[PDB]
Amino acid sequence: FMVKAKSWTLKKPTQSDFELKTVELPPLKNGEVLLEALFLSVDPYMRIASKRLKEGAVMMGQQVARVVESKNSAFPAGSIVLAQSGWTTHFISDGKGLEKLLWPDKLPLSLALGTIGMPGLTAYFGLLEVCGVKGGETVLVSAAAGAVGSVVGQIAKLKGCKVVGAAGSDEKIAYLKQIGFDAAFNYKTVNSLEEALKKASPDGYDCYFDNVGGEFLNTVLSQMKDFGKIAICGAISLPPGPSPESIIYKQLRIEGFIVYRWQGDVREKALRDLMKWVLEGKIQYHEHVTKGFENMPAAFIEMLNGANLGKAVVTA
Amino acid sequence: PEFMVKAKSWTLKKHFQGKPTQSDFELKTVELPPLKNGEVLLEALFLSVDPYMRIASKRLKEGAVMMGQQVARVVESKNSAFPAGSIVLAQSGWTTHFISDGKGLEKLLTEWPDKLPLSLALGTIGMPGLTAYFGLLEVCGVKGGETVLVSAAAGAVGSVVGQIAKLKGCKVVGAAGSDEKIAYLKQIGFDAAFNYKTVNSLEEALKKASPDGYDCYFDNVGGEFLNTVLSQMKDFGKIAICGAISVYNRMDQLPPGPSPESIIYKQLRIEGFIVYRWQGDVREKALRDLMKWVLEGKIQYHEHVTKGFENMPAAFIEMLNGANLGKAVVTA
Numbered sequence: 140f141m142v143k144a145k146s147w148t149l150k151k152p153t154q155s156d157f158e159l160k161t162v163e164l165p166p167l168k169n170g171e172v173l174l175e176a177l178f179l180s181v182d183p184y185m186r187i188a189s190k191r192l193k194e195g196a197v198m199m200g201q202q203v204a205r206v207v208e209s210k211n212s213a214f215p216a217g218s219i220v221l222a223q224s225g226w227t228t229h230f231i232s233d234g235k236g237l238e239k240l241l242w243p244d245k246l247p248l249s250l251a252l253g254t255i256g257m258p259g260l261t262a263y264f265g266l267l268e269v270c271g272v273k274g275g276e277t278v279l280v281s282a283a284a285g286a287v288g289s290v291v292g293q294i295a296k297l298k299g300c301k302v303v304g305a306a307g308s309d310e311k312i313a314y315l316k317q318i319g320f321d322a323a324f325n326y327k328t329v330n331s332l333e334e335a336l337k338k339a340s341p342d343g344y345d346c347y348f349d350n351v352g353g354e355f356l357n358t359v360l361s362q363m364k365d366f367g368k369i370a371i372c373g374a375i376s377l378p379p380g381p382s383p384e385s386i387i388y389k390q391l392r393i394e395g396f397i398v399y400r401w402q403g404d405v406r407e408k409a410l411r412d413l414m415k416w417v418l419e420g421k422i423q424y425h426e427h428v429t430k431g432f433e434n435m436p437a438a439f440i441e442m443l444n445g446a447n448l449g450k451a452v453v454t455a
Numbered sequence: 456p457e458f459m460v461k462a463k464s465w466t467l468k469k470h471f472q473g474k475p476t477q478s479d480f481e482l483k484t485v486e487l488p489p490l491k492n493g494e495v496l497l498e499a500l501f502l503s504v505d506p507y508m509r510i511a512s513k514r515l516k517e518g519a520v521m522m523g524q525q526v527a528r529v530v531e532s533k534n535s536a537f538p539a540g541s542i543v544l545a546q547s548g549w550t551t552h553f554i555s556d557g558k559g560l561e562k563l564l565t566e567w568p569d570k571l572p573l574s575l576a577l578g579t580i581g582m583p584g585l586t587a588y589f590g591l592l593e594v595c596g597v598k599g600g601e602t603v604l605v606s607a608a609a610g611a612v613g614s615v616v617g618q619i620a621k622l623k624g625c626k627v628v629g630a631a632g633s634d635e636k637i638a639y640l641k642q643i644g645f646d647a648a649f650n651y652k653t654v655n656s657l658e659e660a661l662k663k664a665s666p667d668g669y670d671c672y673f674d675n676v677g678g679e680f681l682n683t684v685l686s687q688m689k690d691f692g693k694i695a696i697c698g699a700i701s702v703y704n705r706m707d708q709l710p711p712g713p714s715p716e717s718i719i720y721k722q723l724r725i726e727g728f729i730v731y732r733w734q735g736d737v738r739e740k741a742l743r744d745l746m747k748w749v750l751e752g753k754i755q756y757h758e759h760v761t762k763g764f765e766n767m768p769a770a771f772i773e774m775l776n777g778a779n780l781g782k783a784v785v786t787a
């Protein structure tokens with residue numbers, strides 16, 4: 140009985156720019172493993188990475204998958220792994236891009252795609268290393284209700300900082316207050332972004348974890364404390380020019396970073412911290428689940444437009 | 456026999472709207488009162504015009520004297536701390552003469568070497584030279600071997616940056632505003648230099664000057680140029696934001712900003728700084744280093760001297776255009 144792998148290829152975002160292809164996978168050769176997707180991730184970074192993706196190719200992505208059949212002793216049948224296999228239901232691998240797992244049974248495996256995964260790590264190094272928080276600071280976080288934002292705010296809180304979050308809906312604002320943000324506002328409905336930031340924090344901000352860029356970032360600059368630090372993580376919002384006056388006179392430090400910069404022991408340690416914090420209830424998690432591999436492009440679309448509260452996860 | 460002194464001062468007649476013009480200034484002449492005990496009468500010898508004045512002027516009240524530092528001689532004194540004849544650096548603004556009770560008088564230039572023009576105290580061995588020293592050595596944080604790019608390379612700051620970089624064993628590329636400036640930069644030691652105002656492609660000029668890209672960008676210009684430089688930075692590259700001359704005349708209508716994608720993927724570090732950050736012994740050490748370097752010939756200098764106090768506004772306008780080669784200095 141042969142297995143049929145369904146994959147989402149980039150046709151030309153909108154549904155029409157995605158095309159599902161089906162292929163019968165060949166038998167396993169020695170050293171290979173047959174994997175079945177359990178939970179697939181859709182992330183903001185994909186919209187950009189789609190660039191060098193020649194049409195017809197399977198979309199890039201990470202997923203949590205189970206080993207169904209195996210001829211690889213490192214990955215026995217029944218094993219659960221993290222793979223960079225892209226948007227596909229089944230795939231064959233010689234073990235190249237796979238990471239081990241089964242991890243407390245009480246934690247859903249899909250957390251390895253979010254809070255105890257890439258987004259969680261982005262939040263961790265972004266806040267603890269780029270911003271360099273040590274406690275007592277006032278931290279601003281944009282797209283605060285997203286996968287990265289939600290973690291940044293909760294880590295800031297456990298480190299004893301005052302935390303302000305900017306999100307895209309009133310539903311999200313209630314959520315942020317629920318996970319511990321000291322202040323939270325809908326940046327889309329502000330009368331004055333400048334005054335909202337002032338209201339949120341009269342004395343300004345020590346660190347700004349940026350996921351939006353553009354106008355938001357520019358306005359934030361004027362409210363940074365001297366020697367303030369801005370960690371450029373993403374830019375969901377051509378952006379208007381920043382004021383040189385603020386950067387120079389307040390002597391601000393702006394640094395862009397990619398989570399992949401940190402590897403080895405430091406990365407392993409950060410994942411243990413993230414898992415520990417989740418087990419201690421210090422970092423609550425929420426996954427916006429879309430059921431059905433057939434609904435992945437839609438899930439991807441829904442996420443990009445901000446209809447997602449927390450980590451976007453698609454179940455096979 | 457008391458003869459009165461008349462002080463001439465350049466006042467900001469109207470706040471700058473876009474590029475400053477002669478009509479924005481108004482010369483005033485005033486009869487100075489006699490000195491009271493504890494006061495001193497100073498006569499400007501050399502006056503400075505600097506990029507920061509374009510922005511600092513926004514805080515002035517119309518009719519006020521333009522701000523600025525100058526080297527002045529104490530003509531008469533009733534203040535024991537400033538004897539008649541002494542030379543001082545003072546923040547008295549654009550004025551030929553002024554009375555001070557000690558306020559504004561930053562320091563005596565008593566130990567100054569005669570072979571060095573006093574105006575170097577306003578440039579290479581002054582604020583611009585300090586800005587370059589700390590911007591390069593502390594912000595860019597060079598250790599040697601890096602490839603440094605500096606905009607407005609032939610200006611007061613840029614000229615010093617490139618020279619200190621060279622003594623530190625760095626490769627230096629200068630983006631200057633004229634062909635004469637290119638020749639000058641090469642003569643003082645820059646490894647490469649191009650005219651960013653005439654080169655067909657800024658991208659190709661940067662690539663040609665350094666195929667492997669840049670470790671630090673000492674930014675004096677900002678704007679479109681800065682945005683273009685980001686694509687040429689090496690991963691983890693550092694950009695020291697010193698000034699933004701290309702946008703000082705359009706702070707209310709700024710051009711598009713830098714690519715978030717370049718900053719993120721190249722993982723760049725941008726830091727603004729002002730020379731005020733370094734005070735005390737650290738600043739004194741820098742000044743001593745700057746003077747030693749100038750006396751030894753390791754740091755060459757050129758002053759862009761405009762003769763006559765009545766030409767100060769034009770000197771300021773020219774410098775703002777980035778057209779001065781070396782420190783813009785006005786002789787009274």
Ligand SMILES: [Cl-]
Pocket residue numbers: 206207208216217
């Ligand atoms: Cl199985």
Ligand SMILES: [Cl-]
Pocket residue numbers: 281282283284285288305306307311
């Ligand atoms: Cl959000």
Ligand SMILES: [Cl-]
Pocket residue numbers: 181182183286442447449450451
């Ligand atoms: Cl997400």
Ligand SMILES: [Cl-]
Pocket residue numbers: 469470471509512513514
């Ligand atoms: Cl003005």
Ligand SMILES: [Cl-]
Pocket residue numbers: 515516517
């Ligand atoms: Cl006014």
Ligand SMILES: [Cl-]
Pocket residue numbers: 606607608609610630631632633636777
């Ligand atoms: Cl120049």
Ligand SMILES: [Cl-]
Pocket residue numbers: 504505506610611774779781782783
């Ligand atoms: Cl100058």
